[PDB]
Design an enzyme around this catalytic site. Structure first.
Site, PDB file in Angstrom:
ATOM      1  CB  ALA A   1      23.516  48.874  48.880  1.00 33.47           C
TER       2      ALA A   1
ATOM      3  CB  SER B   1      22.229  48.043  55.579  1.00 36.44           C
ATOM      4  OG  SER B   1      22.832  48.652  54.524  1.00 36.44           O
ATOM      5  CB  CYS B   2      22.194  52.733  56.128  1.00 36.02           C
ATOM      6  SG  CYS B   2      22.542  52.399  58.094  1.00 36.02           S
ATOM      7  CD  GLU B   3      17.672  54.865  50.518  1.00 36.80           C
ATOM      8  OE1 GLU B   3      17.312  53.808  50.604  1.00 36.80           O
ATOM      9  OE2 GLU B   3      17.905  55.138  49.210  1.00 36.80           O
ATOM     10  CG  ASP B   4      24.858  57.834  54.116  1.00 36.00           C
ATOM     11  OD1 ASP B   4      24.884  58.687  52.982  1.00 36.00           O
ATOM     12  OD2 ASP B   4      25.909  57.707  54.978  1.00 36.00           O
TER      13      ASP B   4
END
EC number: 2.3.2.27
Lengths: 598, 112, 599, 112
Positions: free
Chosen positions: A396, A399-402
């Protein structure tokens, strides 16, 4: 006349009877036609009273006086008294006195005898029980510093413009005070909350150094400056005063900024600055507002998180240290275990997960903290699940920290993966399909939460995901897999959104849940557990469908218009929709896929 | 008489040496910088930070790079930088962050 | 080959075995793709000249490199190197380096032909004594903090938008600076003047902690923030920058700020503020500027004297302290007499006179302070003149509000009065006439200074007087009663002022002076000594022509037809008497020719 | 037993006595105020000056009237008012003027 007065008022003749030093400056004030009386540092005990006619201003500072003189009998427009012991105010006051000063007294109460002449009256450093119900309508300045006032009257002089109160132990305000008031100071009072209606001309409001929860939404737009520093404020008001110039909200407990700072037109010629320091802000707000500052087209107010320039640093805490953020009360025995779990792979990924999850406003709520603590409690024992939880925390963050809210959903889903594999489902399909529809619902919630963020600045995606979940717990039948949690706000969710949220999720469950259920997922673990042979047959058929006669029939029509995987994912998908519908009917529970809701 | 060039700022490499340094101060004050390489605002107050080391010979100046010392950065709760922290007798006194030369110098004399 | 030449670095084999710690991070950044080689705190005395092309940011910091490795090559865009004991840099550096930092180093001089693509060069805390003539034009940021540079080169890349030289040893700045410069920091230097020509795009100029006395009147209109604090600034420019936002001009020696602060212009969104703390200002300046800012009709810049709202206090210090402000010579003998002079009446009036006199800019001048010191020694022994000047100083406080100039003139004129009473003027009537002409011109000057001061905010009325007196010393023949003094400035006196003042006074002497002399003055005090007989019969000639003259009834009957005025008639005949008596003694000697037109 | 509400800021009159108040301190810092009973901008910092006294009890707070002490204000070169001055031992240290609560409190910390 006045000669007989004090010469026989020197007759008291206390020790240090140097009242002759006063009369040596008394007549000299009248000899040189002075209206200013300088009476200071007498080593005084008692003061002559009758004296004098036609002296506008007299100063009585640095005295050891006991109380005011009896029957003053003099025309005075200004009376200054300081650093002496006084009972109170004698009623005997002429209607000519425009201003008074009393800054050090052993006073205790309100005489409420009006000269009507007074415009300025301060009461610094002298305790008073309360305030007069009705003071003269000529009073303009009133200062009450370092005292102890319990309650303020319902009606003060209608034309007071300046009011200063720093008295200890004052707790709340009359809703109404006079409208003309433009400046107010209320610090060191240990207050609680502010009125909904303030004077419609108030331009200066100071409530610093006292503990306030939340400021009222409706405030007079005339307010140009506001000091709410050193409070316990959680959420700044949505509708700030229109004429707001400088606002200082430091030393508080702010996590996120009000949403309604898009364009906030500042009336002020000078730009509008909002100073917020020493507040546990979320990374999202600091990143967004500062980036919003970098934009030239930004016409909103100035938010100074720190002075002056800075840069956000993303430091990753160790695993065990991030756990105590959710575990408030715990023994070292837990710590030594968490520190031992730090050695395993995908360790740091989950460490950052707890931080980002706990770096919002609503996820710091004690009851949600309890749920996560309970979830973390099982993990300590489990071991087996943690590995699956840690690996979904890594996928998770790459990909993107958000994307932190999606991981949280896939971690709670991971629990139903192990149980489905640990044989926790003794043919209780009817019970697990209900947990089955809920996860489907929660997936739709995440889909709604993802698109809700795109129109908001400071609210986290987790704040929205938990908002829909908790509020639609009763309307979406989220009985299990969801504990009700009271939050501080709606997390920026309109009532119309809920109407859209209900309908959309309900329909999505009635249309394509049959296709979705087959593919989900932990049931495969159950499916392998219940009918291994029919599993293998449909698995061997899947293996025998690899050598499909019409497999090339799809490939050749794609190259003209790696690639043959999408069709492969489509064929075996239909194979899992058939093995479901078959075995599901064997247990008389093909009834259940059914339809649901309306 | 012995004299050496450069600032009085000591660069740290280990948390064990970081903890050791602030114990060997005594009654003196210790101001710690929390900067890095890629940071812009850190560079604005960086040269000025070393100049305060030559001026104030009473207090100790330390700089802790966040990137290679993340164990210390999370230990002292660094969230933004440049962040200046002040220590005496092994205890944190004042905390300040932001590229402001005025506040930095004024905060030093505030404590000493 | 990179693997070889890096484990080869262990072949020089110094004591530090931490040489291998660097080659560890060298390989880790190749596979993990860090795009940057981060290595410091190692203790490495030298590094290879070969780095992988994959790298683009190279960090060397806080470990001794006694010198540079010759000809580093590869693909470095940014190179950081601070806190090392370095001596020099090579001329063979990668022409792809865009940013280079060198702090706390020991560079003595900068070599030639540094990489063209370099935009940023940091050189804080070094030992650079001279700066190269032609540095690469791609440079946009240069900083030489804590660097002993005598003088900067006249030519610069002309594309720098931020130049910092705040260091040591600067006497002056070149008048040819980068036209694309927007920020300059020349603080903590020892310069005394700023070039008349500066970059026309300059926005930020910091020249704090220097020795500047006067800011140039040709300042870039784009300047928004100007810091001239910690200087020896005497005045402030009449022409402030057009887009000025804030001016930090504290810690200076300003006494009065320019007259060119009316309305000014708010070219900026933020109201223009000028901070001028810790400056010995005149009470006239602080008051009038405060009275300006107090009124809401004000549209000019906000001048900050304090933090800080305040109120000016008027306190008269003891006279024995007020006199030492004029005479520098300190001795116990002199001060004791001034205390005895402080005992008599009207002493506090003269004590306040001295302070209000020396509370300007031009009256603090050493040349003017010298003659006042001499004039004080004149009052130190002459007990008679000291008594009469206190009376004059006493009348100065009552007369309106601020008339210190006229007060100074009356007491200077009173010197001639006491010289006549003692009789220094005997048959030297020809000599005192010339003295009377000069004092007459000074009275005309005083009347001109009053008309001038009404349109002046901060220029004191004394400075206007002393200005006209000194500027017209040659033109009006002020040989006596005026010393050749140099003043810092003309005190607002224009060219048209002097050309007009000259003509007016000369015509005022060709027609009024004959009458003027008669009404004057100390001369009379000579008449009662040089001709006692005529002075007695003159007194008996006014009471003889006032008993029952016809002019009384002619006016008394004329007053009633229109609607103690007899005294106003008395003075009308007195002036005629002083004129007749004068011409008689004038013909007695050869002095009658002297009161001719002259001009 | 002895607890007078009469703060700790200290009134002064005799000039000579004022000088003895600087020797009564010794090494501890003091703060001198010059105020008038008619000064407007001074009224807003007067109560606050006292508030500080009890807080910073380590330093002595002296209050001087300009009107009642013409010799004191002239000796210490008072011009702007309110003017605050600090002393440690003898020698000036620092002074400043204007109505500012922030500058007043910050200066005490800046020194001691």
């Amino acid at each position: 006349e006045l000669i007989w007065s004090e010469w026989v008022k020197e007759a008291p003749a206390k020790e240090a009877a140097n009242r002759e030093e006063a009369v040596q400056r008394m007549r000299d004030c009248l000899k040189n036609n002075k209206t200013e009386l300088r009476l200071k540092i007498l080593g005084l005990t008692t003061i002559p009273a009758y004296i004098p006619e036609q002296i506008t201003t007299l100063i009585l500072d640095n005295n050891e006086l006991k109380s005011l003189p009896e029957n003053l009998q003099g025309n005075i427009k200004t009376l200054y008294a300081n650093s002496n012991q006084l009972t109170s105010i004698p009623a005997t006051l002429p209607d000519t006195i425009q201003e008074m000063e009393l800054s050090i007294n052993r006073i205790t109460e309100l005489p409420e005898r009006l000269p009507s002449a007074l415009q300025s009256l301060d009461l610094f450093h002298n305790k008073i029980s309360c305030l007069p119900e009705n003071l003269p309508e000529e009073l303009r300045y009133l200062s009450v510093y370092d005292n102890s006032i319990r309650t303020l009257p319902a009606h003060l002089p209608s034309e007071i413009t300046h009011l200063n109160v720093q008295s200890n132990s004052l707790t709340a305000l009359p809703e109404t005070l006079p409208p003309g008031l433009k400046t107010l100071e209320a610090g060191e009072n240990a207050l609680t909350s502010l009125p909904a209606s303030l004077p419609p001309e108030l331009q200066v409001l100071d409530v610093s150094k006292n503990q306030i929860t939340v400021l009222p939404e409706t405030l007079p737009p005339t307010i140009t400056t506001l000091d709410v520093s050193r409070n316990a404020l959680t959420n700044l008001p949505e509708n700030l005063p229109a004429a707001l110039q400088i606002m200082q909200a430091s030393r508080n407990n702010l996590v996120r900024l009000p949403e309604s700072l898009p364009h906030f037109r500042g009336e002020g010629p000078q730009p509008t600055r909002i100073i917020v320091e020493y507040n546990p802000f979320s990374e999202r707000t600091i990143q967004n507002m500062q980036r919003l500052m970098s934009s030239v087209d930004y016409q909103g107010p100035r938010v100074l998180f720190a002075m002056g320039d800075f840069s956000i640093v993303r430091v990753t805490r160790p695993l065990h240290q991030a756990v105590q953020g959710w575990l408030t009360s715990l023994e070292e025995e837990d710590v030594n275990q968490w520190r031992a779990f730090e050695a395993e792979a995908n360790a740091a990924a989950f460490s950052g997960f707890l931080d980002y999850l706990g770096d919002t406003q609503n996820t710091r709520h004690p009851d949600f903290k309890e749920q996560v603590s309970a979830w973390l409690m099982r993990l300590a024992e489990d071991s087996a699940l943690r590995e699956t939880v840690f690996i979904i925390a890594m996928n998770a963050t790459i990909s993107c920290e958000d994307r932190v809210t999606l991981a949280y959903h896939q971690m709670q889903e991971a629990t139903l993966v192990h149980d489905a594999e640990r044989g926790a489902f003794d043919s209780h399909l009817a019970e697990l399909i209900m947990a089955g529809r809920e996860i489907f619902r929660l997936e739709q919630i995440e889909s709604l939460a993802r698109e809700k963020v795109k129109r908001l600045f400071f609210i986290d995606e987790v704040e929205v995901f938990l908002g829909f979940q908790n509020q639609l717990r009763e309307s979406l039948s989220l009985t299990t897999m969801t504990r009700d949690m009271r939050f501080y706000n709606v997390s920026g969710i309109t009532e119309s959104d809920l109407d859209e949220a209900e309908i959309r999720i309900k329909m999505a469950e009635n249309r394509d849940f049959h296709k979705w259920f087959a593919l989900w997922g932990p049931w495969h673990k159950v499916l392998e557990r219940i009918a291994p042979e029919e599993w293998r047959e449909m698995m061997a058929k899947r293996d025998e469908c690899i050598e499909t006669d019409e497999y090339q029939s799809r490939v050749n029509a794609e190259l003209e218009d790696a690639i043959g995987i999408k069709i492969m994912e489509e064929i075996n998908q239909t194979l899992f929709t058939e093995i479901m519908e078959n075995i599901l009917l064997k247990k008389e529970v093909s009834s259940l896929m059914s339809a649901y809701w309306r | 008489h012995h004299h050496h060039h450069g600032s009085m700022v000591k660069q740290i490499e280990s948390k064990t040496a970081f903890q050791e340094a602030l114990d060997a101060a005594g009654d003196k004050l210790v101001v710690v910088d929390f900067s890095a390489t890629w940071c812009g605002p850190c560079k604005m107050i960086k040269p000025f930070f070393h100049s305060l080391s030559e001026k104030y010979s009473n207090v100790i100046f330390l700089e802790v790079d966040v990137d290679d010392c993340q164990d210390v950065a999370s230990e002292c709760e660094v969230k933004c930088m440049p962040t200046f922290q002040f220590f005496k007798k092994g205890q944190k006194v004042g905390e300040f962050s932001g590229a402001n030369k005025e506040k930095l110098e004024a905060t030093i004399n505030e404590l000493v």
